[PDB]
Amino acid sequence: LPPDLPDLDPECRELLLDFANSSAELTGCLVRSARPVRLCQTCYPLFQQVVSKMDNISRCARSLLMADRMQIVVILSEFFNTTWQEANCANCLTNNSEELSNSTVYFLNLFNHTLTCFEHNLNYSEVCKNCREAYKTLSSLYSEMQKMNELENHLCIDVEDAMNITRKLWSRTFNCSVPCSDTVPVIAVSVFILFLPVVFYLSSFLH
Amino acid sequence: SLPPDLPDLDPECRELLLDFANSSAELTGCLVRSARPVRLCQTCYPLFQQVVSKMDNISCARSLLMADRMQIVVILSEFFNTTWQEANCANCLTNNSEELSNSTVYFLNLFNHTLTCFEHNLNYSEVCKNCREAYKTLSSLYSEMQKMNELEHLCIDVEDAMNITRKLWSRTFNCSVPCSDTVPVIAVSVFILFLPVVFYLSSFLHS
Amino acid sequence: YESLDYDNSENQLFLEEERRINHRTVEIKRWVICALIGILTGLVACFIDIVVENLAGLKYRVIKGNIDKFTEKGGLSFSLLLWATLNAAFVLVGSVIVAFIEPVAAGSGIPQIKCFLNGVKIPHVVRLKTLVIKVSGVILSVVGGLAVGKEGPMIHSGSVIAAGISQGRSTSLKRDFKIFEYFRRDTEKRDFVSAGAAAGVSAAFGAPVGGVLFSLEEGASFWNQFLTWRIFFASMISTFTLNFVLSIYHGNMWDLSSPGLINFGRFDSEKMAYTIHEIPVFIAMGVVGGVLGAVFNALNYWLTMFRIRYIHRPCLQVIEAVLVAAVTATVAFVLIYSSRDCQPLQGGSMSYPLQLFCADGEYNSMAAAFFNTPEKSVVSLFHDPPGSYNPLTLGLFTLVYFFLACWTYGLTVSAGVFIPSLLIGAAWGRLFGISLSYLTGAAIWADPGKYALMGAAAQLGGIVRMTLSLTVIMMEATSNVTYGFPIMLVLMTAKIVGDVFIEGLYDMHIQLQSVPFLHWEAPVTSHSLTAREVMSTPVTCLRRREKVGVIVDVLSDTASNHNGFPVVARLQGLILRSQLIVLLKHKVFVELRLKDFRDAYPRFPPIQSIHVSQDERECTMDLSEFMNPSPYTVPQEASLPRVFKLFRALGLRHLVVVDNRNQVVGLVTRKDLARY
Amino acid sequence: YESLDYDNSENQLFLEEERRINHTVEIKRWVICALIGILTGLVACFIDIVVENLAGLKYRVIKGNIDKFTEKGGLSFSLLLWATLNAAFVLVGSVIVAFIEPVAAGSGIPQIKCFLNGVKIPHVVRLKTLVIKVSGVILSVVGGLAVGKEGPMIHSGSVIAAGISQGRSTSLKRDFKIFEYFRRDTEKRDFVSAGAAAGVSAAFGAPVGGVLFSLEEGASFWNQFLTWRIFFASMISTFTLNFVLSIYHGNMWDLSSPGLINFGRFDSEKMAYTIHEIPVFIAMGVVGGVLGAVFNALNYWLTMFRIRYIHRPCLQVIEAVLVAAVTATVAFVLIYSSRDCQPLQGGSMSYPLQLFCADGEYNSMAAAFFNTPEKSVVSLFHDPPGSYNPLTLGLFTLVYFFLACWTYGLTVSAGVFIPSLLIGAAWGRLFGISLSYLTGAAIWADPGKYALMGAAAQLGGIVRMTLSLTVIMMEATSNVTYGFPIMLVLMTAKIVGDVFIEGLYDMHIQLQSVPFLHWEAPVTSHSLTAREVMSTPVTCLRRREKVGVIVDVLSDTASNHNGFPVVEARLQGLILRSQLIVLLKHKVFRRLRLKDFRDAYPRFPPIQSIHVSQDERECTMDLSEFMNPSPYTVPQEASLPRVFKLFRALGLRHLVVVDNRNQVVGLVTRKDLARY
Ligand SMILES: *[C@@H]1O[C@H](CO)[C@@H](O[C@@H]2O[C@H](CO)[C@@H](O)[C@H](O)[C@H]2NC(C)=O)[C@H](O)[C@H]1NC(C)=O
Ligand SMILES: *[C@@H]1O[C@H](CO)[C@@H](O[C@@H]2O[C@H](CO)[C@@H](O)[C@H](O)[C@H]2NC(C)=O)[C@H](O)[C@H]1NC(C)=O
Ligand SMILES: Nc1ncnc2c1ncn2[C@@H]1O[C@H](COP(=O)(O)OP(=O)(O)O)[C@@H](O)[C@H]1O
């Protein structure tokens, strides 16, 4: 039999079966730990070992990658890099994708602190109390990390969904707000400036 | 006792997410385990349809799917439609994805017979000769199905099978008809390229 | 308002000066000067764009950082007083320098240059002081938060650059710079002003052939191939210069993704495709835009007439513009404060997300409609996915900004009208798309990114009734050539439906100053007037061998101040008064190589000064080598449509009328011909 | 050859007609121009339909027999079949050209330029000349001549324009009472402009390229609303073509096919250019100018060989047959001897030949032939890098430059553009392949970009028109910033091509003795005034004459003039020959009006066909009512750039020269502005 015309090679079977023994794990990791967005703090070692199993066979690569008009191993790594660049879990990872990053691991705890205060303060009158001094520093920390990535240049998906839940739960379903009835001192100015041009026109029209 | 979808998901649809994930991770196993021997459309044509049926069970519609900016399930199913509609696996399917088509399994059975004819005749003396009939009937059926296509590419299985057949017939064999056909075409070529100078000189001399 | 002479003298000193260059140098000088006009206009455009967006980013960063500190505390009204001041500061600086120093830099530069290419020389139109003041004023007014555009003054900037640097002379610095020394007649000046205006149009809107056809609309001359190809040359130079320099400002250089100051994008993406059945929809939008243009111009006309009659002190119309900026600040803050919707960042659509009252993740919608350049709003009234605005908010912005732009035109600031017309027209033209999506369901062909463009073209053709150059600009700036057909139907419809009511905004402010302004054709509802009506039958003619006692009689009479004289009675040619004083200063008598005519060429020395003596009142001056030996002598019985298409097409400012006898009877100048 | 008036006679009957209509005619011109656009679009679509269908039917024979013999042997029968099909279609499509009417040969452009310039080539507008040329291109592109069909659309546009403007078919000898005002040749010259512009816009899909084509020739005064009606007809023509091709291809509401050839769109960002390769683009223009000079010189000496020796019609038919036979055998030598195969990926061949290849690959030289040349030109502009064998393009280019050159002067209705663009994209692609060999495949060594610049290089080299070719290549590509390298390339190629030989179209103008006019003076001739130019004897009339003098002047039998002045020697007017003919018929020695002067407006009856020599030719004659009272008039000391400016920009055909007093000497009549 000629090489790679009918079938595989013995030193290319394991070079294919390791990737299938791991990419199923990573795809399952995404969809199992998907919608409560815990993704960047769960699936990054599985993702990095998928990258490494791509590399150790990418270095019969021309017998697998460039051997078929629908390059299955290329388009599958391409989709994972598409997700990993769209999620940007590299923000949530410390130095060499080994551990979680320095600030965000504390941001996730202040998310959990704010949820514990929400739960222990359970007609949402007193829930507007007792947590506004923690919701404010939580939003301050989020905006501080967002300005941090602004100085480097959408953030990491793990923290953006946490702040999205926090804002979607504080602002509505609690309706906690401050009126700040500063309407009439605005109207005390916004009418006086609009009253200037009729004075300016009818002043010079008579003189 | 928080309201649903905000801290976590309800367990009423978490089961749907979990057995979608269990099923959808197996499809990666089809795509990568059955990759280089390209048995793709004939292996997980059941596994692809059950993923489509599990998309219908999750269609908690706005609770799962349209509640995040990186919709994991939706972009995964969009990737499965993309991998589906480039392989064109419907051409291997019969009418409504119930089973294969009789034409394609007829082709594959003839294809394995052609490979056995390749294997029995094993210095390519009696290899090119006394085996050409199988290559001609197999390419005949290929061009027959390919002409059948256009009133309605093809399945990746049969197309990569014919790629194997053409790469084997072309190189490592060079089973090539010599086609000694040079001298008449050279005679007609010199016969016609010499006509214009005849025309120009007979136009110049008749003067 | 005195015309200039695009016609050539062709006397004996012109025939001598034709030698020694044909015994080929000047053509490459023409090409290099046109290239420098293009480069300098591109550099001025980059100056304006980078300085304006940096200053405006500074201003709105200061204001945006202010309001969020004062939100929950209760000092919102004290932040209104800052932004009402920050508008009023720059407009005050941006109008004082315009009013007292050069009042000709008011409004746009386009009516003055449009009157220039007809031949009329408005006095202070092409000085360098006018350039400096108009550029500084458009920076201070676009940064000054008014409802203005900065593509208006790019025509006058390019025209002033072109009339300046094609001289090798400044005269506002009293310098000489004898480098070109041949491009100092009004023919060359008019040709280079045509090149500079075309480069200004191309630098403004990013379409070069819009520039060439614009500078060929006005100055409806005879066709001149190498001229128009040089005009196109300078246009391409200016576009590529602007594109290259704004490219390397963003540190990329490798795409060149900005040809003009306003840039529309790619209209090909198959959600923008149009069908043949919705052509009457486009006609209907042309009707709608062609009557709001009439409303705009009419309400400006009764507003401008008031300002001319009363507010004409140069220190009093300055106070007006400050109050205009204050009203823009107050009205915009009132509209922002009272918008009940919030809408999240879609990925960088707003660029200054000003949350007022929202739910801490979402931002205000109306603060995106204000707090921006108008140009980003116009591009974003295009190109959005459908279902991306609130029609109350978006229609409410339209209903205000139309009157704010109608009210901010005749001030003593350097402003535009194009992008305010495009911001109005892309607004209600967007709203028609939402209504078509409301009355047809989710129809694909009612994509409001398509109808937002037709409304922009409709409004821009309605307000400034200009078709051929505008159609090519709108067809090329979108970079899709199948849109020219609905756009040209829209523009025809809007011009007809507009001219059945009112004149036109550029022509109206031209007519309010009573400049002559020869139109394109004759007023075709005038019958066969021969030349024996439209001419001036008492003629002040001269002689060839004539005693100088009727020269100083006719140069100085203080009640019949003319310019240009025919010499005889038969006819021998025409002499110019601007050429005839140089015959007196240098004492040409029987008792000079066309360089004393051209050294002190602009602002010719007025004859009061010379003081000829009384014995030089019987001496004889012979001007036979100075007259134009070929004037243009239409007969008496020539009809009026004949004598227009010589006086208008050829760049004339005199026209002799003679008979079968070749007796000189009358003469046709611009004032004696644009009075019908 | 015959001249063509453009200024109206302005006689008192036309003034009476002005007064009668001025108690609504411009509205007719819009719908006539719209019909010209619609009909030119439908002709272009009909040509595209039938040329796709016949050539689609032709190659399915030839592929189906090359593939039949390639497993047995005997391709000489297939080669004789392919030569017989090519010689048969070219015989059928050329026997109607040499024998029936020899004026439809080649593209219309050398006749349309001279017609817009005012030379009536004796068969330009004729229904027979149309249907020869419409059915000639169909039977010639399918014949396999190396030509392109986008060329001869300009003549189709002009013929249809001048045909449907008149409401009368002289080829059918029937009439209509519809458009009596428009048989007057002031109008008829301007409708040919609209038809040629619409033919250009339906050809290449660039509707300003039509406008700035038909404004280049016919270099007259800026007739504004004419120009706007021309752009109207241009846009309607390209929309009609796009609409009918998009309803024929399916997907009615995807107007994807603007012109006949569609270069794509260049927003791929591998096509992006920057400044560090701008002097590379000057080097391509030099090679384009050199190869265009080689092209035009080879074709020039070929035509000098063809006029003297091959002028019998059947010799020309045998010549046209024995080129298509040679072309197929050259192509089959190249395909049969090619040693490279590349497999198909998507639609790139559509008739693939697995000639000797490995059963899934196909012959690459078979792909370069066996196509529409449009598909190869578009593929060379947009195939990804690393998709051609350089030996393959070298062989194809090197044979195709001669087959384009050898097949131009034949008697077939065909173009030269797509041959010129195909050569230019052919050698231009090699210059982009070798730069990916030196730079190590950098990003600015993009070979799809250097095929675009070589196309404009070769096309500017062969025919020397700019601003009608810069505007197309901006607008077909739909990337605006590409005009700047294209402007550089066209300037370079025109300058380097003019130092060897003239343009191809001006060549074929001057090789058949046309009194043609250029844009300007010959070089300078400023000293050469109107003294040396005018004709010395004057054949002039009087208003108080006697007929019989009319008979002798019109029956000189040695001169055959057409313009005659009338004096008292004081110049009163200028009477034509044809008006004087019509005056000789009816009894003049009252009812006569303008419709009597439009009786069979082309080809009036000559002087021998009127017997009026017994009672008439003995009495007086009054033409005081019938005369042009104000003809344009220069003095003899007018310099030639003032005489040529007044003559060319007005469409005059008789410029009377009158001295100091009104006495007539000489009358400049277009031959003496071409001899210099
Ligand atoms: C047939 O097999 C060959 C390889 O033997 C395929 O060639 C590859 O094609 C892909 C894209 O089609 C390229 O990315 C690879 O670099 C190629 N590799 C080699 C080794 O040539 C070919 O595409 C296959 N054709 C079909 C129709 O399946
Ligand atoms: C915050 O949560 C909301 C929903 O609670 C997200 O809104 C969805 O966004 C996706 C894409 O961004 C859309 O396809 C959905 O249609 C949206 N939902 C609805 C109900 O319209 C929002 O994107 C989240 N924001 C972030 C930053 O995660
Ligand atoms: N030689 C002349 N004879 C009669 N009228 C003249 C003569 N020159 C000028 N005029 C008239 O004087 C008026 C203004 O002319 P002028 O001051 O030269 O202005 P312009 O800038 O239009 O040339 C016009 O009404 C014009 O017809």
Ligand SMILES: Nc1ncnc2c1ncn2[C@@H]1O[C@H](COP(=O)(O)OP(=O)(O)O)[C@@H](O)[C@H]1O
């Ligand atoms: N009546 C005439 N007197 C003098 N020269 C004339 C006269 N008629 C024609 N010519 C000259 O004869 C030449 C050709 O003129 P002709 O053929 O009659 O004009 P057209 O170009 O309209 O056919 C020109 O040089 C023209 O000046």
Ligand SMILES: [Cl-]
């Ligand atoms: Cl503006």
Ligand SMILES: [Cl-]
């Ligand atoms: Cl403006």
Ligand SMILES: [Cl-]
């Ligand atoms: Cl062509």
